[PDB]
């Protein structure tokens, strides 16, 4: 509908520049007729989700690389894609003028944008906050009579969530996660540092903490927001670490098991919010499968846990087959969901690299890895940051797919935004991953899914410098002759006519 306005900041690719009167956008989503495919292309050279169409052909005479769709080989159903409405993201979005705020939110949540259908909401403050607070800071209030939402929620986050929901045609799911409890429930009496809930699961401290979740859901329900899921704690391993710099609450896996079994599971199930799903872990994948074994081999905890939330720190390496693969093998009925991903977190990495194609490729490669290892969704971290990668009260700056520059009333869409978009826009909730088989060894990364209405989507990532000709075969439909240019990502969509073999 409106093309990217590119700008270079001296990194490998460009950002797209948006402001109070202009942002790139798509037309309303339409499928090509039977016999035609749609291709959306982004390239390092600067193409940004450019649409082209081609014929599906009955015949293929070539002998080069063939990717054959396996539409009856079915894997996981997809919950969706989105990102996090932290205090930092809310402050950056609202620092824009109302026209630019609108264009930013449309970029993410509308059908003329990339179709996000998940928002992660911190329960009170985290590092991406400028004030440290919980919802029940008044000490020894075990019945939580003074629980209440501050303006960070009522004036910033809740109104923005409502605006996102109005722009979305897809139903949006909210996920909530706490970082710290009130300090009077913790062993160390501080929001950060090494410390856990006082006492033992099943006691007053633990019962109060579980009740805080229900008060949170109650308070958001007064504002007409309902949650799809909650996690039992953001990064429970972090609060076991001496000197941890920001809000945390430490649980060993046995502690989380007992908390869920004795306190959180029973309290949620006894509430009006009993349909809210509970996700365990909410931490890095190398804690799996150990954490899953500890929690899910206890039948009393197991009966409360709907899924396992995992974090992706894209600056780091970790095995996927031994963590996500093994967890799926051992616990195939417990969904895996990626609840946070970020890049640029190491202190020595420039937090915001405007126009980094490499960070874009890290994002899409991670998403493909995630989907090939049975994960049902992918959630980015902060929806928007400033050019420092903040604000952040401990200076823990990081990158974001949208960077806001208040001094120019401008925001910049990073390659990461488009890499994520190649998935979020084209994979509706309820899509199912299907198999995709290469005829010969090759350098491409790819994934195939089927929409709820039977349509096909294939994402093809080329992290190499070399242009790779290829053909996609859909046994029921025909052949798509294409090329994967060096340093590109493509999404292919087509309708699948009924066909008998
Ligand atoms: C927002 O950005 C747009 C796009 O860059 C600006 O519009 C451009 O302005 C230059 C300078 O006058 C023109 O030469 C271009 O033709 C314009 N392009 C388009 C597509 O309109 C616009 O001025 C900016 N708006 C604000 C409020 O700063
Ligand atoms: C389970 O939830 C019910 C909600 O009905 C709680 O029952 C109420 O508890 C409050 C005090 O906490 C009383 O003022 C009400 O009279 C109770 N209502 C009824 C209908 O009995 C109950 O406390 C919860 N149980 C837990 C958390 O163990
Ligand atoms: N030509 C295939 C090869 O390049 C690997 N790509 S892949 O199969 O898509 C893939 C598998 C596992 C994790 C991430 C991945 F990207
Ligand atoms: N994982 C979420 C947690 O709130 C920490 N925020 S962060 O963006 O991941 C991060 C940034 C900089 C340095 C270290 C970090 F962990
Ligand atoms: N429209 C949102 C829907 O839930 C799925 N969208 S879609 O089918 O992948 C699509 C098709 C054509 C053009 C753009 C698209 F996004
Ligand atoms: C495909 O091949 C066969 C001939 O072997 C025939 O159906 C047709 O001529 C070819 N072309 C198309 C577009 O079907
Ligand atoms: K309060
Ligand atoms: K950094």
Task: Report the distance separating Cα 464 and Cα 257, nearest Å.
Answer: 44
* E strand residue ranges, 44-138: 50-55, 66-77, 80-84, 118-123
Tokens 């949540």 found at = 109
Task: Report the distance separating Cα 159 and Cα 225, nearest Å.
Answer: 10
Ligand 5 contact, 115 CB (< 6 A): yes
User: What backbone phi and psi angles, to 5 degrees, belong to 40?
Assistant: -110, 125
User: What backbone phi and psi angles, to 5 degrees, belong to 368?
Assistant: -60, -45
* Ligand 1 midpoint to CA 395 (Å): 34
Closest atom, ligand 6, to C-alpha of 57? 13
340 is annotated as an active-site residue? yes
Token pair of 369 as six digits: 């890895």
Residues with Cβ within 8 Å of residue 145, at least 6 apart in sequence: none
* Ligand 6 midpoint to CA 62 (Å): 14
Ligand 2 contact, 207 CB (< 6 A): no
Rg (CA), the chain: 23
Token pair of 205 as six digits: 């401290």
Domain boundaries, the chain: 34-76+432-494, 79-424
| Dihedral (CA of 322, 324, 326, 327) sign | positive
Task: Report the distance separating Cα 378 and Cα 420, nearest Å.
Answer: 9
478 dihedral zone (left: phi>0; alpha: psi -120 to 50; beta): left
Three-state DSSP class for residue 41? strand
235 is annotated as an active-site residue? yes
Residues with Cβ within 8 Å of residue 108, at least 6 apart in sequence: 82, 83, 114, 116, 164, 383, 402
User: What backbone phi and psi angles, to 5 degrees, belong to 141?
Assistant: -95, 65
Catalytic-labelled residue, pool 112, 152, 340, 429: 340
Domain 79-424 has CATH 3.40.50.150: no
Catalytic-labelled residue, pool 41, 112, 235, 326: 235
Token pair of 19 as six digits: 């402001």
Residue-by-residue DSSP string for 387-429: TTS---TT------SEEEEGGGTEEEE-HHHHHHHHHHTT--T
CATH class of 34-76+432-494: mainly beta
Token pair of 385 as six digits: 């940051």
Token pair of 468 as six digits: 């790779």
Closest atom, ligand 6, to C-alpha of 58? 14
Ligand 2 contact, 272 CB (< 6 A): no
Task: Report the distance separating Cα 170 and Cα 153, nearest Å.
Answer: 23
* Ligand 5 midpoint to CA 30 (Å): 7
* Ligand 5 midpoint to CA 161 (Å): 22
Task: Report the distance separating Cα 116 and Cα 137, nearest Å.
Answer: 33
Token pair of 345 as six digits: 């977190």
* 2 neighbors 24 (Cβ within 8 angstroms): yes
Token pair of 348 as six digits: 């020595």
Closest atom, ligand 5, to C-alpha of 426? 9
Pairing state between β 375-382 and 80-84? parallel
Pairing state between β 335-342 and 307-313? parallel
| 332 CB neighbour count, 10 Å cutoff | 10
Let me know if the fold of 34-76+432-494 is the same as that of 79-424: no
* 251 neighbors 183 (Cβ within 8 angstroms): no
């Amino acid at each position: 509908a409106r093309p990217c306005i590119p700008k270079s900041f001296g990194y490998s690719s460009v950002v797209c520049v948006c402001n109070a009167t202009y942002c790139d956008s798509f037309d309303p989503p339409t499928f090509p007729a039977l016999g035609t495919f749609s291709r959306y292309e982004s390239t390092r050279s600067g193409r940004r989700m450019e649409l082209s169409m081609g014929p599906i052909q009955a015949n293929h005479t070539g002998t080069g690389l063939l990717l054959t769709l396996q539409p009856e080989q079915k894997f996981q159903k997809v919950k969706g894609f989105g990102g996090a409405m932290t205090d930092a993201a809310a402050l950056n979005i609202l620092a824009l003028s109302p026209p630019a705020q609108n264009l930013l939110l449309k970029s993410y949540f509308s059908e003329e944008g990339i179709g996000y259908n998940i928002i992660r909401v911190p329960m009170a403050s985290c590092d991406f906050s400028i004030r440290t607070y919980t919802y029940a800071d008044t000490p020894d209030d075990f019945q939580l009579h003074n629980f209440s939402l501050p303006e960070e929620d009522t004036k910033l986050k809740i109104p923005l969530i409502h605006r996102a929901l109005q722009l979305a045609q897809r139903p949006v799911s909210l996920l909530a996660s706490p970082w710290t409890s009130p300090t009077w429930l913790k062993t160390n009496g501080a929001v950060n540092g090494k410390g856990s809930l006082k006492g033992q699961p099943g006691d007053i401290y633990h019962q109060t903490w579980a009740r805080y979740f229900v008060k949170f859901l109650d308070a958001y329900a007064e504002h007409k927001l309902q949650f799809w899921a909650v996690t039992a704690e953001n990064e429970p391993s972090a609060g076991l670490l001496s000197g941890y710099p920001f809000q945390c609450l430490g649980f060993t896996p046995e502690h989380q098991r007992d908390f869920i079994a004795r306190d959180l599971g029973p309290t949620l199930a006894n509430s009006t919010h009993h349909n809210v799903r509970l996700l365990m872990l909410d931490d890095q994948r190398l804690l799996l499968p150990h954490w899953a074994k500890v929690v899910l081999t206890d039948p009393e905890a197991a009966k409360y846990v709907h899924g396992i939330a995992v974090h992706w720190y894209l600056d780091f390496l970790a095995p996927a087959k031994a963590t996500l693969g093994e967890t799926h093998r051992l616990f195939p009925n417990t969904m895996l969901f990626a609840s946070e991903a970020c890049v640029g977190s190491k202190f020595w990495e420039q937090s915001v690299r405007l126009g980094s194609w490499d960070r874009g490729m890290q994002y899409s490669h991670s998403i493909i890895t995630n989907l090939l290892y049975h994960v049902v969704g992918w959630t980015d971290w902060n929806l928007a940051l400033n050019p420092e990668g903040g604000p952040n009260w401990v200076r823990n700056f990081v990158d974001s797919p949208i960077i806001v520059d208040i001094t120019k009333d401008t925001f910049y869409k990073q390659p990461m935004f488009y890499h994520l978009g190649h998935f979020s826009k084209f994979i509706p909730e309820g899509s199912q991953r299907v198999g995709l088989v290469a005829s010969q060894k090759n350098d491409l990364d790819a994934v195939a899914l089927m929409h709820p209405d039977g349509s096909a989507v294939v994402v093809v990532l080329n992290r190499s410098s070399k242009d790779v000709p290829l053909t996609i075969k859909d046994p029921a439909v025909g052949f798509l002759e294409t090329i994967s240019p060096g340093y590109s990502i493509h999404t292919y969509l087509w309708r699948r006519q009924h066909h008998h073999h």
